[PDB]
Amino acid sequence: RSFLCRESLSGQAAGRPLVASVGLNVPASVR
Amino acid sequence: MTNIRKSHPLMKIINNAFIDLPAPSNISSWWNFGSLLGICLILQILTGLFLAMHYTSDTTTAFSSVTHICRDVNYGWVIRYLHANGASMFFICLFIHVGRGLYYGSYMFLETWNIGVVLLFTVMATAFMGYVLPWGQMSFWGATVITNLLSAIPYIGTDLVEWIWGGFSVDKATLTRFFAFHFILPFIITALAAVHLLFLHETGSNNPTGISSDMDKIPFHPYYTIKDILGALFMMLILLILVLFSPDLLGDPDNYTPANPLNTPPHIKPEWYFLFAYAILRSIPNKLGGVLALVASILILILMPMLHTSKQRSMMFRPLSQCLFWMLVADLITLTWIGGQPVEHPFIIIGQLASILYFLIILVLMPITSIIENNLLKW
Amino acid sequence: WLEGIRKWYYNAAGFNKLGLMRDDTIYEDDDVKEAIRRLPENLYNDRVFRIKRALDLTMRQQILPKEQWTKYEEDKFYLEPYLKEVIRERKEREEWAK
Amino acid sequence: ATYAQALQSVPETQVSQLDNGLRVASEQSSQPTCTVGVWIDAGSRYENEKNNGAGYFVEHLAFKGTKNRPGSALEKEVESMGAHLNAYSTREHTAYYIKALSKDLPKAVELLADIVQNCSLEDSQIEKERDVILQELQENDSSMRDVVFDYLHATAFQGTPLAQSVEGPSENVRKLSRADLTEYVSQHYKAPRMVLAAAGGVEHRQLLDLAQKHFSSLSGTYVEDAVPAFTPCRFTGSEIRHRDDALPLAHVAIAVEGPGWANPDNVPLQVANAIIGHYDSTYGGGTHMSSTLASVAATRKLCQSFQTFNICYAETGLLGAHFVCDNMSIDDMMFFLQGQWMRLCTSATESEVVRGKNILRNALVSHLDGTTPVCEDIGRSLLTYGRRIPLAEWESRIAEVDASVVREVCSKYFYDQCPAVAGLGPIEQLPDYNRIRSGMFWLRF
Amino acid sequence: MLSRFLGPRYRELARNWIPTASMWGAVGAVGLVWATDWRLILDWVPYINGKF
Amino acid sequence: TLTARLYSLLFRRTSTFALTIAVGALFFERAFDQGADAIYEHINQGKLWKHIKHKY
Ligand code: HEM
Ligand code: HEM
């Protein structure tokens, strides 16, 4: 998504180390 | 900037068909018969045209017009006997083609094999009608005998005969009807042959070894065009020997007599390329059973791909199946010989034995042999 | 005994004369094609070369000299495990679809 | 402790109702946290063409300022106790929920009372908020799934309030003054059409007395006479194609009329939907997934991601699928996806129906994990069904579903029904509407 | 072949498609009687038999 | 409306659609043959052989 606003951009920063996850019937996720 | 060979639509189709088509390297001579069929077809389409250009279709001028083509038309006899014996050449090539497809396990190409069976039926019907055309004694009486089989069909059967006869017996109506059908059918055969080549090209030819040869593939044009030219030369040698030296070798002399419905010839035999099946007809006293066996004798090729039980595809490495296949070929030859001879001792019992053995070999002996065969090779 | 009959059959089959191994002569159905794809590279390369040499020999209608004939004892069984596994997987799929 | 034993041991959903009409509903557990929110029945459905976009604007300005808390002070109270305050507005419901500890319940309920009631709606903040929504509109334009679903709603319920997008056209948002919003608040934020929900370490008696002492000022009247009624929405089977070849991937959503929140046919259809399944390029199941469409897509690398949906409104819904795939796959899935639906309409084996039942049970039990999903479930169920469906009832309704039921309900909703296709991107290969409608019926059946 | 197609769910599919296949066969029978003008059957249908 | 009942009964299934078409073929063929033949005999009354065979 394109972000061009403070409110939408809020929360897109990271404060915890990156954590990937893949499944068998669930799409890939990251945090 | 490109080859018009591989960019022009028609030229692209021709190129993919028989110029740059990947063909197996080790294709034996037995494959040449494929083209030897098509060439025959072309010849049969050619000469027949020049026959239909001097052939009437009325029963008062059928035989006379044929004699006119033979005696008066400039070089007409060449065309007439070229047609008559090119039919036999066509059927020799057809039988050898079916034998090749059977031996090397080419029936695994299901679509091409089924289309081939359809082509076989169409060619046999066309040849039957063509032999009816000259209105000889053999012509008329064989037509009556063959069409009267359809009376055995339950219920509709009788009506069907009166439908095809266009009346009550093979007569004026049936002659012209068979002329029209014999004219139209070969073009249907050509269309089916084109479809057949399409289906075969979707997978590629099968080599004698029966194994996929995608690694050793060679272009068709520089090699197999000249191989096919040599095959056509040999077939022309045989056909021209037949026509020029002994034209009435494969025919029957009684066919040179005007058709007289009030008297029959001493023997009523069909053309040679049909006797193998006619004998089967004569095997079963039950007329309906006879007709059913007659149809099944050809329709068995449809079931043949299903019955394949051997792990290997071809017969190159199956000696037991090789002896079985040659038993089958000898059986077909025996049926052909039996068909000619009259219904007398010992031809009756020999005919029953041959007819039984044919289906026994195709349906039972071959699959069981393949089952023993795999067991003999750890699989 | 039986193994003598099997050896006689291997001799009379003829694929040894072409340098072919048993598994090179098998018909390539879908299961066999997938098994061939599953083969390790080193086995696949030898399979392809053996097949191509055999096709060459049959094109020229010849056989290898008697010394270079795949002996019955030396006829390894490379495609058998992969084909067995493929058949097992297909059987499992069919049983689950049942 | 078998599945059935656990189901009849899930805490209940005690429901109360003050005199004004505000329904209080809680669900006690042992967690030290809680999730308290107010679920109003506002949404784009209750909006005319003149003021479409009012609900989004009100949601934007909710947390900005109040009469009691002038502004950022409200955010300070929310953050000081560690609560996360959120709000989601849809085409039917609009809700505010605070995620906070159990001890902060008296304060959290007060904060929600202030927002839903004494909202400032200052004109300066309205002007500031006007641009933000406009930017968010372009952001949503970048969100291709969302624009495809809005195309679905626009082309399906054309000429009805449902076709209106939640955010509103980027012309109404540029003229929505204070006057329009105030009517929205005073006409939709009413006590009868409100559910005060909470879940976690919440006590139903505590929630009731907090509601009595805070939300008592809520009004149930509707000013002079104006009572916004429920307008039934027609579903007009149509198609819309916004072909933009620049977009890397093509999105196509096709849906037929599904039932409403009532009409228990949802339970069979969901099972049927579960049989179709869902796929993404990063799954890992590959050519082994039980779903036929998923297995085919993985085998041929057809699509990047297909998902089946059952969007459901009060009286009608959009039941169907939405898939994202390249230019030379759109037709092919149209063949398979439709080919899947009709299979369930003509021959649905009991094995796959059992599989769908298990998938549905897993989805329901997993979706109700955590205080926030439970609070959302309570607030949504009290507005849609009028009561929270206990999981045991869900289990019973799922158990009654079998192969014959799925076949009957699919043939009743899928077979020979005009779809509502909507496509975006390089959708050239997308079959013409006549082709899709033809694919909606099988010549074997 | 027949080992694979002999299954619980396979017979269940057969049962599902029994009505459609059977009345497809009825369609074929009626079409055959009509096109052929099978007098043996058409002599019993009330209105149509007046044609003969 | 009757048309809804027709659709739900005889038209939803393609095969039932074909059966309806087939029976309609019978009855339409008979009815149309009767009607057209009657119209023709009415138009040319007294000229056809059917109308004059009685006197021989
Ligand atoms: C009208 C007569 C026929 C024509 C013109 C024709 C044409 C051809 C041609 C040109 C080929 C390629 C050359 C070859 O492999 O032989 C071929 C292949 C083939 N034909 Fe025919 N054919 C005819 C009849 C039949 C019949 C009767 C059958 C058997 C039912 C058949 C089955 C096959 C098979 C199996 C192949 C593939 C052979 C292989 O891959 O080894 N054909 N056909
Ligand atoms: C499929 C290829 C064909 C075959 C196998 C075939 C076979 C035959 C046979 C066996 C005869 C009887 C020969 C005899 O009198 O002893 C014949 C005659 C005849 N055929 Fe064909 N034919 C074929 C194609 C054609 C075509 C395409 C035409 C039309 C252009 C045609 C026209 C005729 C005519 C006019 C006769 C009567 C002349 C005569 O019998 O000598 N044929 N055909």
Helix content of chain D: 40-55%
Count helical runs of chain A. 1
Number of E-type strands of chain D: 12
Strand order in space, largest sheet of chain D:
1-2-6-3-5-4
Number of helices of chain D: 16
- Main pleated sheet of chain A: 2 strands, antiparallel
- Work out the number of β strands of chain A: 2
Small molecules held by this entry: protoporphyrin IX containing FE
Helical content band of chain A: 10-25%
Beta content of chain D: 15-25%
* Biggest contact: B-C, 28 and 25 residues
SSE string of chain A: HEE
**N-to-C span of chain A:** 16 Å
Order of helices and strands of chain D: HEEEHHEEHHHHEHEEHEHEEHHHHHEH
- Backbone CA Rg of chain A: 13 Å
Please state the overall shape of chain D, judged from the principal axes of the Cα atoms. globular
Oligomeric composition of the shown chains: part of a larger assembly
Main sheet makeup of chain D: 6 strands, mixed
* CA-atom Rg of chain D in angstroms: 23 Å
Organism (chain C): Sus scrofa
InterPro entries (chain C): QCR7, QCR7_sf
GO biological process, one term (chain C): mitochondrial electron transport, ubiquinol to cytochrome c
Membrane topology (chain C): Peripheral membrane protein
Question: Helices, strands, pairings?
Answer:
This is part of a larger assembly, with chains A (31 residues), B (379 residues), C (98 residues), D (445 residues), E (52 residues) and F (56 residues).
Chain A: H1 6-9, E1 20-21, E2 29-30
Antiparallel strand pairs in A: 1-2
Chain C: H1 2-13, H2 30-38, H3 41-59, H4 79-97
Helix pairs in contact in C: 2-4
Chain D: H1 3-7, E1 15-17, E2 23-28, E3 33-40, H2 54-62, H3 72-80, E4 84-89, E5 94-101, H4 105-115, H5 123-142, H6 144-156, H7 178-188, E6 194-200, H8 204-214, E7 240-243, E8 250-258, H9 266-276, E9 278-280, H10 292-300, E10 303-312, E11 317-325, H11 330-346, H12 350-367, H13 371-384, H14 391-399, H15 403-413, E12 422-425, H16 433-439
Parallel strand pairs in D: 2-6, 7-12
Antiparallel strand pairs in D: 1-2, 3-5, 3-6, 4-5, 8-11, 8-12, 9-10, 10-11
Helix pairs in contact in D: 2-5, 2-7, 4-8, 9-12, 9-15, 10-11, 11-15, 12-14
The structure holds protoporphyrin IX containing FE (2 copies).
One protoporphyrin IX containing FE binds at residues 44-45, 48-49, 51-52, 55, 66, 80, 83-84, 87, 90, 123, 126-127, 130-131, 133-134, 182-183, 186, 189, 251 of chain B.
Protein name (chain B): Cytochrome b
Transmembrane segments (chain B): 30-52, 81-103, 115-133, 140-158, 178-200, 221-245, 288-307, 319-340, 346-368
Membrane topology (chain B): Multi-pass membrane protein
Describe the protein.
The structure is cut from a larger assembly and holds chains A (31 residues), B (379 residues), C (98 residues), D (445 residues), E (52 residues) and F (56 residues). By secondary structure, chain A is α+β, with helices and mostly antiparallel strands. Chain A contains one helix and two strands; from the N terminus they run αββ. The two termini of chain A are 16 Å apart. Chain C is mainly α. Chain C is built from four helices and no strands. In chain D, α9 packs across α15. In chain D, the strands form two sheets. Chain D has a six-stranded mixed β-sheet, with helices on both faces. In chain D, strands 7-12-8-11-10-9 form a six-stranded mixed β-sheet, sandwiched between helices. Chain D is an alpha+beta fold. Chain D contains 16 helices and twelve strands. Helix content of chain D is 42%, strand content 17%. Chain F has 56 residues and is mainly α. Chain F contains three helices and no strands. Chain F is elongated, with a radius of gyration of 19 Å. Chains in contact: A-D, B-C, C-E, D-E, D-F, E-F. Chains B and C meet through loops of B and α1 and α3 of C. Bound molecules: protoporphyrin IX containing FE (2 copies). One protoporphyrin IX containing FE (HEM) binds next to α2, α4, α5 and α8 of chain B. One protoporphyrin IX containing FE binds next to α2, α4, α5 and α8 of chain B. Chain E: It is found in: Mitochondrion inner membrane. Chain E: This is Cytochrome b-c1 complex subunit 10. Chain E: Belongs to the UQCR11/QCR10 family.
